[PDB]
Short mmCIF file of C-alpha atoms and ligand atoms in Angstrom, two decimals:
data_model
loop_
_atom_site.label_atom_id
_atom_site.label_comp_id
_atom_site.label_asym_id
_atom_site.label_seq_id
_atom_site.Cartn_x
_atom_site.Cartn_y
_atom_site.Cartn_z
CA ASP A 1 -20.67 -83.93 59.95
CA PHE A 2 -17.02 -84.11 60.96
CA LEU A 3 -16.52 -80.47 60.12
CA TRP A 4 -19.28 -79.19 62.39
CA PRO A 5 -18.17 -78.01 65.80
CA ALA A 6 -19.75 -79.70 68.78
CA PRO A 7 -22.04 -77.66 71.08
CA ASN A 8 -20.16 -76.04 73.87
CA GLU A 9 -20.86 -76.49 77.67
CA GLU A 10 -22.98 -73.39 77.93
CA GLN A 11 -25.16 -74.54 75.02
CA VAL A 12 -25.78 -78.01 76.43
CA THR A 13 -26.49 -76.54 79.83
CA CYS A 14 -29.05 -74.26 78.40
CA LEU A 15 -30.63 -77.12 76.38
CA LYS A 16 -31.03 -79.21 79.54
CA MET A 17 -32.39 -76.52 81.86
CA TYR A 18 -34.99 -74.97 79.51
CA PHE A 19 -35.97 -77.74 77.14
CA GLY A 20 -35.12 -80.85 79.19
CA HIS A 21 -32.98 -82.71 76.60
CA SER A 22 -29.45 -83.97 77.18
CA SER A 23 -28.24 -83.69 73.58
CA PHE A 24 -29.21 -82.07 70.31
CA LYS A 25 -30.38 -84.19 67.45
CA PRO A 26 -27.85 -84.04 64.55
CA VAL A 27 -29.97 -81.93 62.15
CA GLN A 28 -31.28 -79.72 64.94
CA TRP A 29 -27.72 -78.89 65.75
CA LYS A 30 -26.76 -78.22 62.17
CA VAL A 31 -29.67 -75.74 61.90
CA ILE A 32 -29.15 -74.18 65.34
CA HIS A 33 -25.43 -73.76 64.87
CA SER A 34 -25.92 -72.30 61.39
CA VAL A 35 -28.53 -69.77 62.56
CA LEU A 36 -27.11 -68.91 65.96
CA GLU A 37 -23.36 -68.90 65.40
CA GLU A 38 -23.06 -68.53 61.58
CA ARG A 39 -26.05 -66.16 61.17
CA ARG A 40 -27.16 -67.96 58.02
CA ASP A 41 -30.55 -68.35 56.40
CA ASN A 42 -31.81 -71.94 56.55
CA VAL A 43 -34.34 -74.18 54.77
CA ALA A 44 -34.89 -77.20 56.99
CA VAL A 45 -36.95 -80.37 56.31
CA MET A 46 -37.51 -82.65 59.21
CA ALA A 47 -39.39 -85.87 59.77
CA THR A 48 -42.50 -86.02 62.02
CA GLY A 49 -41.60 -85.98 65.62
CA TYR A 50 -37.96 -84.99 64.97
CA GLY A 51 -38.07 -81.71 66.88
CA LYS A 52 -38.42 -78.83 64.53
CA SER A 53 -39.70 -76.23 67.09
CA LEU A 54 -36.44 -76.47 69.05
CA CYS A 55 -34.63 -75.00 66.04
CA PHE A 56 -36.36 -71.64 66.49
CA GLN A 57 -37.15 -71.74 70.19
CA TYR A 58 -33.67 -72.49 71.32
CA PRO A 59 -31.49 -69.69 69.82
CA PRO A 60 -33.34 -66.68 71.30
CA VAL A 61 -33.57 -68.45 74.69
CA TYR A 62 -29.83 -69.07 74.74
CA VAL A 63 -28.88 -65.48 73.91
CA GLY A 64 -31.78 -63.86 75.76
CA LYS A 65 -33.19 -61.95 72.74
CA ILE A 66 -36.21 -62.23 70.44
CA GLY A 67 -37.21 -65.02 68.06
CA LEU A 68 -40.03 -64.04 65.72
CA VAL A 69 -42.26 -66.99 64.64
CA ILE A 70 -44.62 -66.47 61.67
CA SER A 71 -47.48 -68.89 61.18
CA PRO A 72 -51.11 -68.82 60.05
CA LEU A 73 -52.14 -71.37 62.67
CA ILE A 74 -53.17 -69.18 65.53
CA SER A 75 -54.43 -72.00 67.78
CA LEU A 76 -51.15 -73.92 67.33
CA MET A 77 -49.21 -70.79 68.33
CA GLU A 78 -51.41 -70.47 71.40
CA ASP A 79 -50.63 -74.02 72.30
CA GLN A 80 -46.89 -73.54 71.91
CA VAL A 81 -46.98 -70.42 74.03
CA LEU A 82 -48.51 -72.45 76.86
CA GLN A 83 -45.93 -75.23 76.47
CA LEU A 84 -43.16 -72.66 76.60
CA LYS A 85 -44.62 -71.00 79.69
CA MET A 86 -44.77 -74.37 81.35
CA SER A 87 -41.04 -74.62 80.86
CA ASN A 88 -40.46 -71.18 82.30
CA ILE A 89 -39.80 -69.59 78.90
CA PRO A 90 -41.69 -66.28 78.34
CA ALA A 91 -43.54 -66.19 75.02
CA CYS A 92 -46.57 -64.49 73.60
CA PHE A 93 -48.80 -64.26 70.57
CA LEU A 94 -48.77 -60.75 69.16
CA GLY A 95 -51.72 -59.58 67.14
CA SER A 96 -54.00 -56.67 66.64
CA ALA A 97 -56.30 -57.93 69.45
CA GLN A 98 -53.46 -58.03 72.00
CA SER A 99 -53.17 -55.68 74.89
CA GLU A 100 -50.93 -52.64 74.86
CA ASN A 101 -49.20 -53.99 77.96
CA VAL A 102 -48.01 -57.08 76.17
CA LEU A 103 -46.68 -54.93 73.35
CA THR A 104 -44.97 -52.71 75.99
CA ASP A 105 -43.26 -55.77 77.49
CA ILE A 106 -42.15 -57.09 74.04
CA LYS A 107 -40.48 -53.71 73.36
CA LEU A 108 -38.56 -54.15 76.63
CA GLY A 109 -37.29 -57.63 75.91
CA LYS A 110 -39.54 -59.60 78.30
CA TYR A 111 -40.55 -62.17 75.63
CA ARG A 112 -38.06 -64.61 74.11
CA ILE A 113 -40.45 -66.04 71.45
CA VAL A 114 -43.02 -63.87 69.70
CA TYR A 115 -45.62 -65.44 67.52
CA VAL A 116 -47.32 -63.49 64.72
CA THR A 117 -49.43 -64.14 61.62
CA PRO A 118 -47.96 -63.29 58.12
CA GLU A 119 -50.62 -60.62 57.76
CA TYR A 120 -49.82 -58.94 61.09
CA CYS A 121 -46.08 -59.17 60.32
CA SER A 122 -46.42 -57.62 56.88
CA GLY A 123 -48.11 -54.52 58.19
CA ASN A 124 -45.80 -53.92 61.15
CA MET A 125 -42.31 -53.93 59.71
CA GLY A 126 -41.69 -50.64 61.55
CA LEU A 127 -42.26 -52.38 64.95
CA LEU A 128 -39.92 -55.23 63.89
CA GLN A 129 -37.20 -52.72 63.06
CA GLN A 130 -37.64 -51.11 66.52
CA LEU A 131 -37.28 -54.53 68.20
CA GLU A 132 -34.24 -55.28 66.14
CA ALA A 133 -32.58 -51.96 67.23
CA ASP A 134 -33.70 -51.96 70.87
CA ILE A 135 -33.47 -55.69 71.72
CA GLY A 136 -32.24 -57.64 68.75
CA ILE A 137 -34.01 -60.36 66.73
CA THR A 138 -32.06 -63.58 66.79
CA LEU A 139 -33.95 -65.22 63.93
CA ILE A 140 -37.31 -65.28 62.09
CA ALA A 141 -38.98 -68.59 61.68
CA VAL A 142 -41.52 -69.38 58.95
CA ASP A 143 -43.14 -72.78 59.15
CA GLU A 144 -45.81 -73.61 56.65
CA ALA A 145 -43.38 -71.80 54.32
CA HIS A 146 -44.65 -74.12 51.60
CA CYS A 147 -47.75 -71.83 51.64
CA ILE A 148 -45.54 -69.22 49.91
CA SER A 149 -45.39 -71.46 46.70
CA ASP A 150 -52.07 -74.46 50.29
CA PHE A 151 -50.92 -71.21 48.67
CA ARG A 152 -51.33 -68.04 50.72
CA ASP A 153 -50.94 -64.52 49.37
CA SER A 154 -50.23 -63.48 53.04
CA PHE A 155 -46.84 -65.26 52.80
CA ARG A 156 -45.68 -63.30 49.60
CA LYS A 157 -45.78 -60.25 51.88
CA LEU A 158 -42.81 -61.73 53.72
CA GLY A 159 -40.59 -60.71 50.77
CA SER A 160 -40.01 -57.40 52.55
CA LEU A 161 -38.41 -59.03 55.67
CA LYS A 162 -34.91 -59.12 54.09
CA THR A 163 -35.17 -55.49 53.06
CA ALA A 164 -36.41 -54.26 56.45
CA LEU A 165 -34.26 -56.63 58.50
CA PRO A 166 -31.19 -57.48 56.31
CA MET A 167 -29.16 -58.71 59.36
CA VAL A 168 -31.82 -61.20 60.67
CA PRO A 169 -31.44 -64.80 59.49
CA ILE A 170 -34.61 -66.60 58.45
CA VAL A 171 -35.34 -70.29 59.16
CA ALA A 172 -37.87 -71.74 56.70
CA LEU A 173 -39.48 -75.01 57.64
CA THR A 174 -41.16 -77.25 55.00
CA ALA A 175 -42.53 -80.75 54.77
CA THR A 176 -40.78 -82.38 51.83
CA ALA A 177 -37.38 -82.29 50.13
CA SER A 178 -39.08 -80.99 46.92
CA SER A 179 -36.68 -78.77 44.94
CA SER A 180 -39.57 -76.86 43.34
CA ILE A 181 -41.02 -75.85 46.73
CA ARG A 182 -37.56 -75.06 48.04
CA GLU A 183 -36.87 -72.77 45.06
CA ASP A 184 -40.15 -70.90 45.69
CA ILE A 185 -39.28 -70.55 49.33
CA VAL A 186 -35.82 -69.12 48.53
CA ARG A 187 -37.28 -66.78 45.97
CA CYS A 188 -40.23 -65.46 47.94
CA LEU A 189 -38.30 -65.09 51.16
CA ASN A 190 -35.20 -63.64 49.43
CA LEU A 191 -32.88 -66.05 51.26
CA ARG A 192 -29.14 -65.64 50.72
CA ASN A 193 -27.02 -68.75 50.31
CA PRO A 194 -29.24 -70.68 52.73
CA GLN A 195 -28.12 -73.85 54.53
CA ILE A 196 -30.32 -76.67 53.31
CA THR A 197 -30.91 -79.68 55.56
CA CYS A 198 -33.11 -82.82 55.51
CA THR A 199 -33.36 -85.45 58.24
CA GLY A 200 -34.94 -88.06 55.98
CA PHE A 201 -38.45 -89.23 56.66
CA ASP A 202 -38.64 -92.74 57.92
CA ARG A 203 -40.35 -93.50 61.21
CA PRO A 204 -39.19 -97.10 61.64
CA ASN A 205 -41.40 -97.84 64.68
CA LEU A 206 -44.62 -97.08 62.77
CA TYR A 207 -46.03 -100.25 61.06
CA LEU A 208 -48.27 -99.43 58.08
CA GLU A 209 -51.46 -101.33 57.06
CA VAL A 210 -54.44 -100.82 54.74
CA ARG A 211 -57.65 -102.78 54.91
CA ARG A 212 -61.19 -102.57 53.48
CA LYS A 213 -64.19 -101.43 55.51
CA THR A 214 -66.57 -104.26 56.21
CA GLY A 215 -69.92 -102.38 56.07
CA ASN A 216 -70.31 -101.68 59.78
CA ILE A 217 -68.26 -99.43 62.14
CA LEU A 218 -68.00 -101.77 65.12
CA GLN A 219 -66.99 -104.64 62.90
CA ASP A 220 -64.30 -102.42 61.40
CA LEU A 221 -62.92 -101.33 64.82
CA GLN A 222 -63.28 -104.55 66.80
CA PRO A 223 -59.73 -105.78 65.80
CA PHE A 224 -58.25 -102.84 67.67
CA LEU A 225 -60.12 -103.57 70.87
CA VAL A 226 -59.44 -106.03 73.63
CA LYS A 227 -62.25 -107.38 75.85
CA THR A 228 -61.21 -107.92 79.43
CA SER A 229 -63.66 -109.86 81.58
CA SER A 230 -64.85 -106.56 82.96
CA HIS A 231 -64.98 -104.27 79.94
CA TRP A 232 -63.84 -103.42 76.45
CA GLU A 233 -60.70 -101.22 75.87
CA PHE A 234 -58.39 -100.16 73.11
CA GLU A 235 -55.17 -102.02 72.95
CA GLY A 236 -53.39 -98.78 73.63
CA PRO A 237 -53.85 -95.01 73.27
CA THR A 238 -55.38 -94.40 69.88
CA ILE A 239 -56.22 -91.59 67.48
CA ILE A 240 -59.00 -92.15 64.98
CA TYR A 241 -58.86 -89.66 62.12
CA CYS A 242 -62.21 -88.94 60.43
CA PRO A 243 -62.96 -86.95 57.28
CA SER A 244 -65.80 -84.92 58.78
CA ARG A 245 -67.57 -83.96 61.96
CA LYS A 246 -70.47 -86.20 60.90
CA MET A 247 -68.26 -89.26 60.57
CA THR A 248 -66.65 -88.31 63.94
CA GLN A 249 -70.15 -88.33 65.59
CA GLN A 250 -70.99 -91.70 63.98
CA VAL A 251 -67.65 -93.32 65.15
CA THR A 252 -67.88 -91.86 68.55
CA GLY A 253 -71.50 -93.10 68.96
CA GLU A 254 -70.48 -96.63 68.20
CA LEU A 255 -67.46 -96.55 70.56
CA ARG A 256 -69.73 -95.40 73.41
CA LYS A 257 -71.85 -98.52 72.91
CA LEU A 258 -68.91 -100.30 74.48
CA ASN A 259 -68.46 -97.65 77.08
CA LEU A 260 -65.02 -96.69 75.69
CA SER A 261 -63.52 -93.50 77.10
CA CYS A 262 -62.96 -91.11 74.18
CA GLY A 263 -62.98 -87.42 73.19
CA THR A 264 -63.42 -85.60 69.97
CA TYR A 265 -60.96 -83.06 68.44
CA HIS A 266 -61.92 -80.49 65.78
CA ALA A 267 -60.87 -77.14 64.40
CA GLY A 268 -62.40 -74.19 66.17
CA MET A 269 -62.29 -75.62 69.69
CA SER A 270 -61.43 -73.16 72.43
CA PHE A 271 -57.99 -72.94 74.12
CA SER A 272 -59.65 -74.23 77.30
CA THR A 273 -61.19 -77.20 75.45
CA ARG A 274 -57.94 -78.12 73.79
CA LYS A 275 -56.19 -77.98 77.18
CA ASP A 276 -58.87 -80.32 78.68
CA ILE A 277 -58.38 -82.85 75.91
CA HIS A 278 -54.62 -82.64 76.23
CA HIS A 279 -54.88 -83.26 79.92
CA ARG A 280 -57.23 -86.24 79.66
CA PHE A 281 -55.38 -87.93 76.79
CA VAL A 282 -51.90 -87.48 78.24
CA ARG A 283 -53.10 -88.90 81.58
CA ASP A 284 -54.95 -91.74 79.92
CA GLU A 285 -58.30 -90.51 81.32
CA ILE A 286 -59.46 -91.04 77.85
CA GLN A 287 -58.16 -93.83 75.64
CA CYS A 288 -59.07 -92.53 72.18
CA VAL A 289 -59.26 -89.17 70.43
CA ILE A 290 -61.45 -89.05 67.30
CA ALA A 291 -60.00 -86.19 65.30
CA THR A 292 -60.62 -84.11 62.21
CA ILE A 293 -57.45 -82.09 62.64
CA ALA A 294 -53.89 -83.29 62.87
CA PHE A 295 -52.14 -80.68 65.07
CA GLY A 296 -52.35 -79.01 68.46
CA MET A 297 -52.00 -79.94 72.11
CA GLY A 298 -55.18 -82.15 72.12
CA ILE A 299 -53.28 -84.94 70.33
CA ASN A 300 -49.77 -84.14 71.58
CA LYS A 301 -48.88 -87.29 73.48
CA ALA A 302 -45.75 -89.48 73.75
CA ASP A 303 -47.27 -92.96 73.73
CA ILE A 304 -49.85 -93.13 70.96
CA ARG A 305 -49.78 -96.86 70.03
CA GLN A 306 -52.45 -96.89 67.29
CA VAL A 307 -53.52 -94.51 64.52
CA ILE A 308 -56.68 -95.39 62.55
CA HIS A 309 -57.65 -93.49 59.45
CA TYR A 310 -61.40 -94.13 59.12
CA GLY A 311 -61.93 -93.52 55.50
CA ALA A 312 -59.46 -93.14 52.59
CA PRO A 313 -56.99 -90.24 53.13
CA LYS A 314 -57.00 -87.62 50.38
CA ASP A 315 -53.24 -86.84 50.07
CA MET A 316 -50.05 -88.55 51.13
CA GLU A 317 -48.52 -85.48 52.81
CA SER A 318 -51.49 -85.04 55.12
CA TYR A 319 -51.42 -88.80 55.78
CA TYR A 320 -47.73 -88.69 56.79
CA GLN A 321 -48.24 -85.85 59.14
CA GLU A 322 -51.32 -87.51 60.66
CA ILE A 323 -49.72 -90.83 61.35
CA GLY A 324 -46.56 -89.04 62.62
CA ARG A 325 -48.42 -88.21 65.79
CA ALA A 326 -47.98 -91.79 66.76
CA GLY A 327 -44.99 -93.52 68.40
CA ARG A 328 -43.22 -90.34 69.62
CA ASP A 329 -41.66 -92.37 72.37
CA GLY A 330 -39.89 -94.61 69.79
CA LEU A 331 -41.84 -97.74 70.82
CA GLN A 332 -43.78 -99.92 68.35
CA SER A 333 -46.98 -98.36 66.99
CA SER A 334 -49.33 -99.28 64.20
CA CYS A 335 -51.08 -97.11 61.56
CA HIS A 336 -54.11 -98.52 59.78
CA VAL A 337 -56.24 -97.17 56.96
CA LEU A 338 -59.79 -98.44 56.66
CA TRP A 339 -61.23 -97.53 53.33
CA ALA A 340 -64.00 -98.23 50.70
CA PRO A 341 -64.36 -97.27 47.10
CA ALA A 342 -67.21 -94.99 48.15
CA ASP A 343 -64.65 -92.96 50.06
CA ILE A 344 -62.78 -92.24 46.85
CA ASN A 345 -65.82 -90.77 45.09
CA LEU A 346 -66.72 -88.49 48.01
CA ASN A 347 -62.93 -87.51 47.90
CA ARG A 348 -63.40 -86.77 44.25
CA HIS A 349 -66.28 -84.37 44.85
CA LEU A 350 -64.48 -82.36 47.54
CA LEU A 351 -61.66 -81.64 45.12
CA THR A 352 -64.05 -80.34 42.42
CA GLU A 353 -64.92 -77.60 44.98
CA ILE A 354 -61.36 -76.25 44.65
CA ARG A 355 -61.72 -72.99 42.74
CA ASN A 356 -58.11 -72.45 41.50
CA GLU A 357 -57.44 -74.81 38.64
CA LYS A 358 -53.74 -75.20 39.27
CA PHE A 359 -54.34 -76.04 42.98
CA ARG A 360 -57.19 -78.34 42.07
CA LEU A 361 -55.02 -80.25 39.53
CA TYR A 362 -52.30 -80.66 42.12
CA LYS A 363 -54.80 -81.98 44.66
CA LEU A 364 -56.33 -84.37 42.08
CA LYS A 365 -52.81 -85.78 41.43
CA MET A 366 -52.26 -86.12 45.15
CA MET A 367 -55.53 -88.11 45.38
CA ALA A 368 -54.55 -90.42 42.51
CA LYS A 369 -51.22 -91.00 44.23
CA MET A 370 -53.06 -91.90 47.44
CA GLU A 371 -55.40 -94.24 45.59
CA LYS A 372 -52.35 -96.05 44.17
CA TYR A 373 -50.96 -96.35 47.72
CA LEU A 374 -54.17 -97.95 48.93
CA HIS A 375 -54.31 -100.44 46.09
CA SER A 376 -50.66 -101.41 46.07
CA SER A 377 -49.38 -104.94 46.46
CA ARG A 378 -45.82 -103.57 47.12
CA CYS A 379 -44.13 -102.02 50.12
CA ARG A 380 -46.26 -99.17 51.61
CA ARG A 381 -43.27 -97.49 53.23
CA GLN A 382 -41.28 -97.40 50.03
CA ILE A 383 -44.16 -95.49 48.35
CA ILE A 384 -44.43 -92.84 51.15
CA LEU A 385 -40.72 -92.27 51.52
CA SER A 386 -40.31 -91.88 47.72
CA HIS A 387 -42.89 -89.07 47.73
CA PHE A 388 -41.15 -87.12 50.50
CA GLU A 389 -37.64 -87.70 49.13
CA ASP A 390 -39.01 -86.66 45.70
CA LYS A 391 -37.26 -89.65 44.13
CA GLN A 392 -37.56 -93.46 44.11
CA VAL A 393 -36.32 -94.74 47.43
CA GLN A 394 -34.57 -98.09 47.16
CA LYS A 395 -35.86 -100.91 49.46
CA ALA A 396 -32.34 -101.97 50.40
CA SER A 397 -31.63 -98.49 51.75
CA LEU A 398 -33.41 -99.01 55.09
CA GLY A 399 -33.25 -102.01 57.36
CA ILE A 400 -36.92 -101.73 58.29
CA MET A 401 -38.21 -102.20 54.75
CA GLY A 402 -38.97 -105.78 53.72
CA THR A 403 -39.42 -106.96 57.29
CA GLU A 404 -42.51 -108.13 59.15
CA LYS A 405 -42.57 -104.81 61.02
CA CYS A 406 -42.47 -102.67 57.86
CA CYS A 407 -45.97 -102.85 56.41
CA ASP A 408 -48.76 -105.28 55.74
CA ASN A 409 -47.60 -106.09 52.18
CA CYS A 410 -44.03 -106.78 53.37
CA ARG A 411 -45.32 -108.92 56.21
CA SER A 412 -47.77 -110.81 53.91
CA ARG A 413 -45.01 -111.52 51.36
CA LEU A 414 -42.97 -113.08 54.18
CA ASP A 415 -45.74 -114.99 55.87
CA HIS A 416 -46.49 -116.78 52.56
N1 ACP B 1 -32.95 -82.85 71.26
C1 ACP B 1 -34.03 -83.61 71.52
N2 ACP B 1 -33.92 -84.72 72.23
C2 ACP B 1 -34.99 -85.42 72.50
N3 ACP B 1 -36.24 -85.17 72.16
C3 ACP B 1 -36.36 -84.01 71.47
C4 ACP B 1 -35.33 -83.17 71.19
N4 ACP B 1 -35.78 -82.06 70.42
C5 ACP B 1 -37.14 -82.27 70.41
N5 ACP B 1 -37.49 -83.39 71.03
C6 ACP B 1 -38.86 -83.87 71.05
O1 ACP B 1 -39.28 -84.35 69.78
C7 ACP B 1 -40.68 -84.17 69.66
C8 ACP B 1 -40.98 -83.52 68.35
O2 ACP B 1 -40.97 -82.03 68.54
P1 ACP B 1 -41.61 -81.11 67.42
O3 ACP B 1 -41.24 -79.67 67.50
O4 ACP B 1 -41.32 -81.71 66.07
O5 ACP B 1 -43.18 -81.32 67.82
P2 ACP B 1 -44.10 -81.11 66.50
O6 ACP B 1 -43.62 -81.97 65.32
O7 ACP B 1 -45.53 -81.60 66.93
C9 ACP B 1 -44.13 -79.38 65.99
P3 ACP B 1 -45.80 -79.11 65.42
O8 ACP B 1 -46.76 -78.93 66.53
O9 ACP B 1 -45.64 -77.74 64.54
O10 ACP B 1 -46.18 -80.21 64.51
C10 ACP B 1 -41.18 -83.45 70.90
O11 ACP B 1 -41.75 -84.36 71.85
C11 ACP B 1 -39.89 -82.83 71.41
O12 ACP B 1 -39.90 -82.61 72.90
ZN1 ZN B 2 -19.56 -72.54 62.68
ZN1 ZN B 3 -42.91 -102.60 53.56
#
């Protein structure tokens, strides 16, 4: 880190005025400096809540050119376009349903960040070459780039990017430090001598706990409630993750027996609906969001104190991203799984519905790994971190591990 140059005054000024931060995080700066000043391909792995979006939003804003962001999650791109607009950064989603006037303005440099799907991107390389020649593309970002190894044939089409745009660096974002996924990303995207970075994965302010369902929803959730003389309330802002819309309706119906303010959050909700939930949750006009999806502005909030998984999670990478929505302000939060053996069998049936055998076998292994996490008598955090590091993490390596704030098993081993 000693070798890296510090950001200069213009760069920090830009960071403060358009993104509202006083300093870059260390790995953000490594990626940004590498892409912006060294023009190098990057594969970057960042913890939840670290700040991965800044890595591709900042460079084109600083130089006043175009950053191309490729993602399959259209609703999430819509959400990020709105957040950028609220910060006076012009951005748009570009697709086949977009108006000609937006495309006209993109060709004139009016938009700093252009979001597209891999499908649209693969059939419009001619447009991207015109943008490169007329305006200049600072970088191309591919998050969900693991999909190139949930596999998506749409991502393999991105292999033509480096042919059409040999001068444009690509930033690939992925969830784990797995070398096998990284090798597929480099191969499929044709990256050249990419810079590889990893923040590490620990969220030390997230306490981990697993407990058994008791047979009744209200009995399960009562420990997370406080009863003022006037009314019931959650201890703090809370997300309850459910495995289905049906379970969401069941959980929500029970919470409303106590007149608790909540909202639901599902895939397929409109832009307006997502904006309404974001507004009410951020302003604490609702105390709880019961969710079947783990991304989007509906659950983007700084002070989530409690995450509850109502039912056994199916895989440890989804679990990590779901609990990572908590504690973004750095203050103490708690993450509880409530599970029953019956969950595991329903989990087992949903994986038999996976057609592709290789993907189904991978998912079945991820479930077995999650089942071992739920049953463990050892440190929960050590198990999760080892999966993301793709190697056994030593307990002595982090000060949080083995303390009363680490996890239920660490706490119970100390309290007796
Ligand atoms: N240099 C910096 N200093 C302080 N906070 C920063 C920061 N860069 C980013 N952040 C904040 O860190 C948080 C994490 O941002 P990030 O881009 O990872 O959101 P995210 O993980 O939800 C992307 P996605 O929606 O794809 O999951 C945000 O609240 C962001 O404002
Ligand atoms: Zn340099
Ligand atoms: Zn522990």
